Coordinates of C-alpha atoms (C1' of nucleotides) and ligand atoms in Angstrom, one line a residue:
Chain L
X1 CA 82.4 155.6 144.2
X2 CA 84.8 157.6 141.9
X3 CA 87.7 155.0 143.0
X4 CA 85.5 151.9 142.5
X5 CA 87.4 150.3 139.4
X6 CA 85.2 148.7 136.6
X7 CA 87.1 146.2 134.4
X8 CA 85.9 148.7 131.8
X9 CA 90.1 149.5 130.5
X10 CA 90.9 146.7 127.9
X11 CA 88.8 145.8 124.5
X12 CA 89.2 141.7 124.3
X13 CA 87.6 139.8 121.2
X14 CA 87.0 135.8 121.5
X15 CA 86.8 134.5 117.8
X16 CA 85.6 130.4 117.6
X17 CA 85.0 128.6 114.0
X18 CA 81.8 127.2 113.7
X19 CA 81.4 123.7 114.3
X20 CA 85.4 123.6 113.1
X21 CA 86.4 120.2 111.6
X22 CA 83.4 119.9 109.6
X23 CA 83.8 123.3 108.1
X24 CA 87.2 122.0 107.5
X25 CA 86.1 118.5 105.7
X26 CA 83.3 120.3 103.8
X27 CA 85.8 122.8 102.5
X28 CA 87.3 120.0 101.0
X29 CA 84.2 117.8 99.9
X30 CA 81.5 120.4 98.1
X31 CA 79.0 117.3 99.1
X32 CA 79.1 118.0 102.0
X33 CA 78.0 121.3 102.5
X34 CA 75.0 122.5 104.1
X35 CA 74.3 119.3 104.8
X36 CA 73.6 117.7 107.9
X37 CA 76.6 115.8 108.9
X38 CA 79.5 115.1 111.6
X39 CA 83.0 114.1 111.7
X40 CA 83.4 110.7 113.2
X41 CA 86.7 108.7 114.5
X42 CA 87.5 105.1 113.8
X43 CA 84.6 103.3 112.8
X44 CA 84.4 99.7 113.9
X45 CA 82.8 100.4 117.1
X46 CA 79.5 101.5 116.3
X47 CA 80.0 103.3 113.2
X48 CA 82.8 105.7 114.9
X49 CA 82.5 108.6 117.7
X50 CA 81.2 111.8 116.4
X51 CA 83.7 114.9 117.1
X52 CA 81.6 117.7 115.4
X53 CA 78.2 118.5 113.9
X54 CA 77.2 120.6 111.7
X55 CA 74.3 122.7 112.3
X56 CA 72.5 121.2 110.0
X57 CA 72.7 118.0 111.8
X58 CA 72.3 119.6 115.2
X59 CA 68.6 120.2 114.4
X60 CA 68.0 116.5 114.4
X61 CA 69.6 116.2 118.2
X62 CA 73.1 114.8 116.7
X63 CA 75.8 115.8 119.6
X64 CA 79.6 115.3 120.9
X65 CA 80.2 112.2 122.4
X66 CA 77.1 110.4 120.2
X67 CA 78.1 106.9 118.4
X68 CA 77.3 107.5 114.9
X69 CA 75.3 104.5 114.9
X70 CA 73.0 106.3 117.2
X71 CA 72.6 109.6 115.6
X72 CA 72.2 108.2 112.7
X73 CA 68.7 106.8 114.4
X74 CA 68.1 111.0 114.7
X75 CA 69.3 111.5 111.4
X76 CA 69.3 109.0 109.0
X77 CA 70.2 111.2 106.0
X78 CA 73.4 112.4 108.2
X79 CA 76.6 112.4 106.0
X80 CA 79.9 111.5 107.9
X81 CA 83.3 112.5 107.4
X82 CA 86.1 110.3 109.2
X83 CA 89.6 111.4 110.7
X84 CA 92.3 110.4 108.8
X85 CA 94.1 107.0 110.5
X86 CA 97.8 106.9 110.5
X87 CA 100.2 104.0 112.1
X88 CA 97.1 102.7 113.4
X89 CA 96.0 105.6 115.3
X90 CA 93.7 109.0 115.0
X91 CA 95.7 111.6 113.0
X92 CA 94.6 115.4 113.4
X93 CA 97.0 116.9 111.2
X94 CA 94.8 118.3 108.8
X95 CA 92.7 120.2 111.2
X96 CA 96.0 121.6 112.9
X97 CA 97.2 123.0 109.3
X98 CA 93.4 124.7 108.8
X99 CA 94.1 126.4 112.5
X100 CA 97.5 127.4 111.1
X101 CA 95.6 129.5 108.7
X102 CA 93.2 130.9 110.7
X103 CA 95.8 132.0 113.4
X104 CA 97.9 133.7 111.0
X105 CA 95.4 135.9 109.5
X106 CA 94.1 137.0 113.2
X107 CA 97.5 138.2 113.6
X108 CA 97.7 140.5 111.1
X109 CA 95.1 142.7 113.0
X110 CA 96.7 141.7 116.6
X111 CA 98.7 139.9 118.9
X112 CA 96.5 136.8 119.8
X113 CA 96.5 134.2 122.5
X114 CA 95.7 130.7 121.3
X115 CA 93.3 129.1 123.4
X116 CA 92.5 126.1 121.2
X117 CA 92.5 124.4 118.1
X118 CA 90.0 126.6 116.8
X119 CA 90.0 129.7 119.3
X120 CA 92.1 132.8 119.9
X121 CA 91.8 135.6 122.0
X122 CA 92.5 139.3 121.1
X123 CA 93.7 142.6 122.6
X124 CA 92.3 144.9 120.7
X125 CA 93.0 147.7 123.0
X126 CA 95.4 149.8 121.1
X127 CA 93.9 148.9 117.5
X128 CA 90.8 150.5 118.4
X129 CA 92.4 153.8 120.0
X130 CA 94.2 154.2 116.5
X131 CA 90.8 153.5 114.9
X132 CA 89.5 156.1 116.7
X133 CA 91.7 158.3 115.7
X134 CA 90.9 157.8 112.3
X135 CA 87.3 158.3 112.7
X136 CA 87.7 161.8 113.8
X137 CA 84.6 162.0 115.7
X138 CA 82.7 160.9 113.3
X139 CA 79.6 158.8 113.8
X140 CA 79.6 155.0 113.5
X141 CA 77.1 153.5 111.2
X142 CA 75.0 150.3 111.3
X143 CA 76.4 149.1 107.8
X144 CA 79.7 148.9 109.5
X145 CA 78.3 146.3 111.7
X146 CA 76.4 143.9 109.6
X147 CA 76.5 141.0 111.7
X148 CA 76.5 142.1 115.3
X149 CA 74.3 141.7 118.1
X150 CA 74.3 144.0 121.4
X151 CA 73.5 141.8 124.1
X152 CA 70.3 142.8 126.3
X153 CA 69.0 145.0 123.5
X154 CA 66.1 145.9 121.8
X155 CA 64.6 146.8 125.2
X156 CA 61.5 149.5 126.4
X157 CA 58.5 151.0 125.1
X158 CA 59.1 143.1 114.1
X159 CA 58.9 139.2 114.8
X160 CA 62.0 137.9 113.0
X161 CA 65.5 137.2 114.0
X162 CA 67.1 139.9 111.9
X163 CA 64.8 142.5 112.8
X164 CA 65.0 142.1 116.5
X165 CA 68.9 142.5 115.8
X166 CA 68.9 145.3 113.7
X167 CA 66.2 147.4 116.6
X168 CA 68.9 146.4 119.1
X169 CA 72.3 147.6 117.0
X170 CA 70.2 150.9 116.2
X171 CA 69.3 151.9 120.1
X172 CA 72.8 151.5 120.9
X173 CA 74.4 153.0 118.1
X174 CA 71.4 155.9 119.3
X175 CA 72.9 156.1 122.1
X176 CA 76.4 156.6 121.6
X177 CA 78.8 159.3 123.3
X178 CA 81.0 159.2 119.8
X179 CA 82.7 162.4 121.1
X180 CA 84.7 161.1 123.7
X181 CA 87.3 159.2 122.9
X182 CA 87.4 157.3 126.4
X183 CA 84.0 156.0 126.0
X184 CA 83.7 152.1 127.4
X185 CA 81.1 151.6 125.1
X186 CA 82.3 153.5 122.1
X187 CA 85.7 151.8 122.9
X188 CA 83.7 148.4 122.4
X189 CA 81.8 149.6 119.1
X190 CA 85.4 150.2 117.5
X191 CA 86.1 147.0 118.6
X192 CA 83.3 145.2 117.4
X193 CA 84.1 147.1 113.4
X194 CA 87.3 145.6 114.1
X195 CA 86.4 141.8 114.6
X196 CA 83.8 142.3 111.6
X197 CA 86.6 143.0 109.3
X198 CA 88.7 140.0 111.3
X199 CA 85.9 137.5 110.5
X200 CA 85.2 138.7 107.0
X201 CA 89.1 138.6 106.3
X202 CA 89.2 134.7 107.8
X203 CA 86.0 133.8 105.6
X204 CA 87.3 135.8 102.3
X205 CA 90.5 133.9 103.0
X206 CA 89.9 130.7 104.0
X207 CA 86.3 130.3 103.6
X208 CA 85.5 129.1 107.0
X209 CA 83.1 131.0 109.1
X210 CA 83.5 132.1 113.0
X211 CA 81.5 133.7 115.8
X212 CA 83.2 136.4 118.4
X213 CA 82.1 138.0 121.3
X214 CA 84.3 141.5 122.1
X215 CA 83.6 142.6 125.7
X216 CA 86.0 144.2 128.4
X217 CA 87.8 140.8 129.4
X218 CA 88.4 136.9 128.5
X219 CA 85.4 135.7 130.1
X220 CA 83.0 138.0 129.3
X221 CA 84.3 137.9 125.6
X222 CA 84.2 133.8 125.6
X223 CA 80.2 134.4 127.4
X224 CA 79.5 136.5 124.3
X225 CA 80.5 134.4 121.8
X226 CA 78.1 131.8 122.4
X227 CA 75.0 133.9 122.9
X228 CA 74.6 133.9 118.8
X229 CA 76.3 131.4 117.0
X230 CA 76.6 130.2 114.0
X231 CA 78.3 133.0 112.1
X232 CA 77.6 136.1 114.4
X233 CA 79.1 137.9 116.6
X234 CA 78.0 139.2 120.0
X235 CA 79.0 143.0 122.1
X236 CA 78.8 142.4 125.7
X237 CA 78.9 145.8 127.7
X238 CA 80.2 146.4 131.0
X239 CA 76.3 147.9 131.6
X240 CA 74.4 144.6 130.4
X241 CA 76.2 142.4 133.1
X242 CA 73.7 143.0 135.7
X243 CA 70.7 141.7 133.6
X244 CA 73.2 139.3 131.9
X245 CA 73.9 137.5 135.6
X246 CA 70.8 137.7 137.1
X247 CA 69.2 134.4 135.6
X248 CA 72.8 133.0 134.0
X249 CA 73.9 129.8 135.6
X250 CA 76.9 129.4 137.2
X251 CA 78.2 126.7 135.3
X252 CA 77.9 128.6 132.0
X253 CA 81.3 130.9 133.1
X254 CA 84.7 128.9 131.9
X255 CA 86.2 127.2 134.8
X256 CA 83.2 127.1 136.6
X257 CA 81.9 124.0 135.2
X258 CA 82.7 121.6 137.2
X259 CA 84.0 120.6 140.7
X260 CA 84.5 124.5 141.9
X261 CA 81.3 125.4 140.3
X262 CA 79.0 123.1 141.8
X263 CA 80.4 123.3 145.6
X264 CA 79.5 127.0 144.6
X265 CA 75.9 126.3 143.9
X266 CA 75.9 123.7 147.3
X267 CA 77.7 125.6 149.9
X268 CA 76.2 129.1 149.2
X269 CA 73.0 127.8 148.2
X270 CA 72.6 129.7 144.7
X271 CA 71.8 129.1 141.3
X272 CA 72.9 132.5 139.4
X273 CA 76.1 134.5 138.6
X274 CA 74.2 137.3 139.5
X275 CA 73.6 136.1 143.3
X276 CA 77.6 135.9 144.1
X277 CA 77.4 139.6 144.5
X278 CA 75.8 139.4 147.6
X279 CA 78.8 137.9 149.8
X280 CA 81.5 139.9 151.0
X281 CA 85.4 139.4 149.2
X282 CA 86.3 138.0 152.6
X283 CA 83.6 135.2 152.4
X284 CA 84.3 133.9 149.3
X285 CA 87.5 133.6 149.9
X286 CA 86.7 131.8 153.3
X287 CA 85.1 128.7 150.7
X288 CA 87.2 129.0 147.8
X289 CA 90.3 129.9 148.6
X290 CA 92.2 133.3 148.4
X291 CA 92.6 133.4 144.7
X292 CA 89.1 131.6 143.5
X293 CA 87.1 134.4 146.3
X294 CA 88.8 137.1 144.7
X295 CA 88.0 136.1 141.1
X296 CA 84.8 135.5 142.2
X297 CA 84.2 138.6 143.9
X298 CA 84.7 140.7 140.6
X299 CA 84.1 138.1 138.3
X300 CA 80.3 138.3 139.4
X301 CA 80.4 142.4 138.7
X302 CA 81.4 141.3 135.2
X303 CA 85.6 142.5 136.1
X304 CA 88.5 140.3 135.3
X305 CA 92.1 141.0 134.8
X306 CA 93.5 138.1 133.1
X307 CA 95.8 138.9 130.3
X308 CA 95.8 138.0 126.6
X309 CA 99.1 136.5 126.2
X310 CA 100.8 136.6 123.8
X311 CA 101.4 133.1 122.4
X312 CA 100.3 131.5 118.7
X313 CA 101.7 128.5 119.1
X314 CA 101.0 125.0 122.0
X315 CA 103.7 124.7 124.3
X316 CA 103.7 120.7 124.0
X317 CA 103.2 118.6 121.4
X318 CA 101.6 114.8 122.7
X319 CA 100.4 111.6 120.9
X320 CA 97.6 109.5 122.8
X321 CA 96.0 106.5 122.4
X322 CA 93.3 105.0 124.2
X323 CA 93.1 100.8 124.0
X324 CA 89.3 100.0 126.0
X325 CA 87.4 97.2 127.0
X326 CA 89.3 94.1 125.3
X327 CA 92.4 95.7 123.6
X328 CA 94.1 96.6 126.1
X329 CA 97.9 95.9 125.7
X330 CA 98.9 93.1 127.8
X331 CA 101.9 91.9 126.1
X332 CA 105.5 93.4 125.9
X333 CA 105.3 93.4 122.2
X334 CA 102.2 94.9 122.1
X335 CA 103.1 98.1 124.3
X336 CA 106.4 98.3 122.6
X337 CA 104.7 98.1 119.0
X338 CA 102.0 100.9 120.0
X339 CA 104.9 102.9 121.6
X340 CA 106.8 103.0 118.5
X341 CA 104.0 104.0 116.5
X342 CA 103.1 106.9 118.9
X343 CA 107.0 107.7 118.9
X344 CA 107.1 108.1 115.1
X345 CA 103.8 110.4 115.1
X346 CA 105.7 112.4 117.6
X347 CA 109.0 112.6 115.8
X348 CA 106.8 113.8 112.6
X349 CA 105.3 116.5 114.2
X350 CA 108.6 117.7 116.6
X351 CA 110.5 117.6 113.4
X352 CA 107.9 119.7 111.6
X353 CA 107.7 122.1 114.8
X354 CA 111.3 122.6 114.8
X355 CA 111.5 123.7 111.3
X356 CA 108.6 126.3 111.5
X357 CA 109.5 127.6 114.7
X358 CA 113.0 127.4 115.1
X359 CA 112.5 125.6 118.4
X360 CA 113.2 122.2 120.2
X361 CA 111.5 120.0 122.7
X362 CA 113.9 119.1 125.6
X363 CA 111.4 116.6 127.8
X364 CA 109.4 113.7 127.2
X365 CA 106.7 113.2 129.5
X366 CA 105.4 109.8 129.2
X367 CA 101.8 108.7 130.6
X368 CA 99.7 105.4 130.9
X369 CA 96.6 104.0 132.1
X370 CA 96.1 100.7 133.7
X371 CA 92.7 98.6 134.0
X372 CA 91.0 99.9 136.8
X373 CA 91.4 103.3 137.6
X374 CA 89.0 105.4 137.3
X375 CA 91.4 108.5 137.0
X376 CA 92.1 109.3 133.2
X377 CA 96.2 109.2 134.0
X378 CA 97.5 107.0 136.2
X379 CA 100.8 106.8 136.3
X380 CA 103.3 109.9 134.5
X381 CA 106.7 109.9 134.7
X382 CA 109.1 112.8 132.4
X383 CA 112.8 111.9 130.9
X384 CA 115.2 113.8 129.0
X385 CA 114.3 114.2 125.1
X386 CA 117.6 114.6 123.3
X387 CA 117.2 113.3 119.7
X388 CA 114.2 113.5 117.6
X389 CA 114.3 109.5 116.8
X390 CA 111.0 107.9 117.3
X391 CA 113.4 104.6 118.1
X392 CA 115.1 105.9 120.9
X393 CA 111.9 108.2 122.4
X394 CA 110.2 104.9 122.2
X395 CA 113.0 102.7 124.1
X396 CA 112.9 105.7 126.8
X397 CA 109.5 105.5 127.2
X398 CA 109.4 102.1 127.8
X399 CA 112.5 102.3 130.3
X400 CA 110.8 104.8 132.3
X401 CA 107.3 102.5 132.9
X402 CA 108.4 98.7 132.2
X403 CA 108.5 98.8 136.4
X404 CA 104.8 99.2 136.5
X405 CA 104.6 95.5 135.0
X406 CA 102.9 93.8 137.9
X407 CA 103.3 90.6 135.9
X408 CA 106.3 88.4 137.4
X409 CA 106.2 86.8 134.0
X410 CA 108.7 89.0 131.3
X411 CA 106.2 88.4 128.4
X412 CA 103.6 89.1 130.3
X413 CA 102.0 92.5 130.9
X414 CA 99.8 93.4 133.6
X415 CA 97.8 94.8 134.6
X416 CA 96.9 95.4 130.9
X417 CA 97.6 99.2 129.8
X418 CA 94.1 100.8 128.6
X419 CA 96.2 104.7 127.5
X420 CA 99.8 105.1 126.1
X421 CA 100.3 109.1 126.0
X422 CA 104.2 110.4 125.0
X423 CA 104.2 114.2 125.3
X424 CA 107.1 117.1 124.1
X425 CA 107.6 119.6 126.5
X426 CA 109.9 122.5 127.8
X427 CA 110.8 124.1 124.5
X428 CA 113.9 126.3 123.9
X429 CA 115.0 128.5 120.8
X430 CA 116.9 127.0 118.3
Chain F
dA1 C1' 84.0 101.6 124.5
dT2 C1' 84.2 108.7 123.8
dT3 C1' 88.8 109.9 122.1
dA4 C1' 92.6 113.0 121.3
dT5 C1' 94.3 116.5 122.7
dG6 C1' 96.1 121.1 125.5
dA7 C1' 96.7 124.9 129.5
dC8 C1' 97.3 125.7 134.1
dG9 C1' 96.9 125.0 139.5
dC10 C1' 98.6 122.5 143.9
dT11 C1' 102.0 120.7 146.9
Chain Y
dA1 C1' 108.2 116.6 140.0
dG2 C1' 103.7 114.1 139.6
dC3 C1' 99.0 114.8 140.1
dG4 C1' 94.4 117.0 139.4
dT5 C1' 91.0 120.2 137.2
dC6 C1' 88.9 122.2 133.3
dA7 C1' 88.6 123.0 128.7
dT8 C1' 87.9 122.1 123.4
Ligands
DTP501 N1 85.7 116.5 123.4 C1 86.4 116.6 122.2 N2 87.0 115.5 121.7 C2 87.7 115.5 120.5 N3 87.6 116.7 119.8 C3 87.0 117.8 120.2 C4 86.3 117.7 121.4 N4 85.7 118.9 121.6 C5 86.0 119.7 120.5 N5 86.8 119.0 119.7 C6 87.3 119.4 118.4 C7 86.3 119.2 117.3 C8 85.7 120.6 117.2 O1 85.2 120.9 115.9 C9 86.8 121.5 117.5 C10 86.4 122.8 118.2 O2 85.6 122.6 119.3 P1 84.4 123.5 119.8 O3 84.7 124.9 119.6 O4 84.0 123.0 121.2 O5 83.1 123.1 118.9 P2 82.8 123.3 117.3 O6 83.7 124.3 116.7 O7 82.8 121.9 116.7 O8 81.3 123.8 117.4 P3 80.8 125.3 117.7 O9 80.2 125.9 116.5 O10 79.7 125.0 118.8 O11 82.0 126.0 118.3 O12 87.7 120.8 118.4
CA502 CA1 84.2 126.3 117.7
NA503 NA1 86.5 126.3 120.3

DNA sequence: ATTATGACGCT
DNA sequence: AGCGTCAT
């Protein structure tokens, strides 16, 4: 009833680039844009792994994970960027530096939480209460949001994108309560005039273009952001999250795509977000655990309490490698070489870090793989990191696993290592 | 032979 | 601490 809390109190924005590091490569190359084409890694193994499409390329089927032999069988006129190799290795440096300039900008409307390379969450709570202040009242117009859509509108008693998106922004700016201040929905609308100006400042500034979704919490603001991408952005109200959940799959809500989600879809026997709301707090929590059930248990009536913290910058800094199939390391020279060469990456980036942040790392975790395991890590084991010298990181590192060598002979490594991962972590001010 | 990352939860 | 899950 009147105590019955809604998840309604907060304004949260989730801006993404579009398709980022070939926005960022066609910045750079005039070539390549609007073109159909991906950024690829290393190249020997079947023409390189594509990282990002464009949407362009996306029409043709080209995907994540694809060789680019393979989509170039989709696409033969696909044009491919590669990442930049350094000390024989992957180097995403330049697509770290373009993030830099996006995250900066977003924080010149508000504090921001960094959730990737490419995404940052907002709190736009207070900005839009001194917004509408400003307003006075006064109505909101449809010019002020040229690129939004309101999610589960036009509805009730044109056939072109546009149109459709237009009849939906004018119902609900129709419908509008612009005379209270403590609106939900009005409350959203200010926020949604906000992120316009956010995105237009990020593509005046840097020319790369973005999506958003602003809702009432993380999730629901992440949801959004998807339902109209490229270049869009999408207002998911507290209101349209019945209709929203009804025939939305559970695996479509972030963390519920894997393991968690789909002993949710087995052990209660449902396909929908929508259908959780139909088991008491107690139950799910009986399945899940006390912390999933209760996230559940809101999450379904679109209400989550997460923060947006605030944090621009990644707690650690790590350098990976991955050495398949055949090259995997089974020499001491050889794991020493590649440790080196991951130590010296590190010690770039640390030094770099420390002189932009005013901050030091003060442990180095160190990870490795052997052939076999199915896991991803299988063996991780943390020292102290007292000098930024990629020599001495490198000898540490090697200290800290050279007692997984199975081999009896010295030389000799084995089993032969198929991941090297050194990692910075457990920063303090400096 | 996806690869290179990065945050956070569990015990 | 070391491991696992989930994500981009
Ligand atoms: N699995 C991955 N492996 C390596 N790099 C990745 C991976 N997933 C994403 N990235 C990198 C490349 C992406 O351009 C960037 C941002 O990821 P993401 O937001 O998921 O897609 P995107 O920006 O390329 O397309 P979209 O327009 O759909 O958001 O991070
Ligand atoms: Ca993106
Ligand atoms: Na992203």
């Amino acid at each position: 009833g009147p105590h019955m809390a809604t998840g309604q109190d907060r304004v949260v924005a989730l801006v993404d680039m579009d398709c980022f590091f070939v926005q960022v490569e066609q910045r750079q190359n005039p070539h390549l844009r609007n073109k159909p084409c991906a950024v690829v890694q290393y190249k020997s193994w079947k023409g390189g792994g594509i990282i990002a499409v464009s949407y362009e390329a996306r029409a043709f089927g080209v995907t994540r994970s694809m060789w680019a032999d393979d989509a170039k069988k989709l696409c033969p006129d696909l044009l491919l960027a590669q990442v930049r190799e350094s000390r024989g290795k992957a180097n995403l440096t330049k697509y770290r530096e373009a993030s830099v300039e996006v995250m900066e900008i977003m924080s010149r409307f508000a504090v921001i939480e960094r959730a990737s390379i490419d995404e940052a969450y907002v709190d736009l709570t207070s900005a839009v209460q001194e917004r509408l202040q400003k307003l006075q009242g006064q109505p909101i117009s449809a010019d002020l949001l040229p690129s939004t859509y309101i999610e589960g509108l036009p509805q009730g008693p044109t056939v072109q994108k546009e149109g459709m998106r237009k009849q939906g922004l004018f119902q609900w700016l129709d419908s509008l309560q612009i005379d209270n201040l403590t609106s939900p929905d009005l409350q959203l609308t200010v926020g949604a005039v906000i992120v316009e100006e956010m995105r237009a400042a990020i593509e005046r500034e840097t020319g790369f273009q973005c999506s958003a979704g602003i809702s009432h919490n993380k999730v629901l603001a992440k949801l959004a952001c998807g339902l109209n991408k490229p270049n869009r952005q999408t207002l998911v109200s507290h209101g349209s999250v019945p209709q929203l959940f009804s025939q939305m799959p559970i695996r479509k809500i972030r963390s519920l795509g894997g393991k968690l989600g789909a002993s949710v879809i087995e052990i209660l026997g449902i396909e929908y977000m929508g259908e959780l709301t139909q088991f008491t707090e107690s139950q799910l929590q009986s399945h899940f655990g006390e912390k999933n059930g209760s996230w559940l248990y809101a999450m379904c009536r679109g209400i989550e309490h997460d923060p947006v913290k605030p944090r621009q910058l990644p707690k650690t800094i790590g350098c990976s490698k991955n050495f398949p199939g055949k090259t995997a390391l089974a020499t001491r020279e050889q794991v020493q070489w590649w440790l080196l060469q991951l130590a010296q990456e590190l010690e770039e980036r640390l030094t770099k870090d420390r002189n932009d942040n005013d901050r030091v790392a003060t442990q180095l975790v160190v990870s490795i793989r052997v052939q076999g395991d199915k896991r991803l890590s299988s063996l991780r084991r943390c020292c102290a990191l007292t000098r930024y010298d990629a020599h001495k990181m490198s000898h540490d590192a090697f200290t800290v696993i050279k007692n997984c060598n199975t081999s009896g002979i010295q030389t000799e490594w084995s089993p032969p290592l198929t991941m090297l991962f050194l990692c910075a972590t457990k920063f303090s001010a400096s």
